[PDB]
């Protein structure tokens, strides 16, 4: 299994190889190789994305957003890593 595979099953899913995780799941970042996207079934505590470094940007940002979570602003959205 890929180096870090096996650590992110614990930490943020499973890790397959594209982001086309299924629901409720986030593809959160990528586990070991980029070339594979890890998934954890992100319903409760799952709004994990601060471990990512899940960033914040404002509803004027042009980013790929939506992480998980809430920022500390209300009407911001946690986004994937700017």
Same mark, same amino acid.
């Given at each position: 299994?890929?180096?870090?595979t &096996?650590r992110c $099953?614990?930490? %943020?899913?499973?890790? /397959?190889?594209?982001?086309?995780c299924? +629901?409720? !799941?986030?593809? !959160?970042? *990528?586990? &070991? @190789?980029?070339?594979? *996207?890890?998934? $954890?079934? *992100?319903?409760?505590? !799952? %709004? *994990?994305?601060?471990? +990512?470094?899940? %960033? =914040? $940007?404002?509803? +004027? /940002?042009? =980013?790929?957003?939506?992480?998980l979570? #809430?920022?500390? #602003?209300?009407? @911001?959205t946690?986004? +994937?890593? /700017?």
């Amino acid at each position: 299994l890929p180096r870090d595979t &096996s650590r992110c $099953v614990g930490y %943020h899913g499973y890790c /397959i190889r594209s982001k086309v995780c299924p +629901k409720p !799941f986030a593809a !959160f970042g *990528t586990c &070991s @190789w980029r070339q594979k *996207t890890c998934c $954890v079934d *992100t319903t409760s505590d !799952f %709004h *994990t994305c601060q471990d +990512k470094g899940g %960033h =914040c $940007v404002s509803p +004027k /940002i042009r =980013c790929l957003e939506e992480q998980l979570g #809430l920022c500390p #602003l209300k009407r @911001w959205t946690c986004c +994937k890593e /700017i």
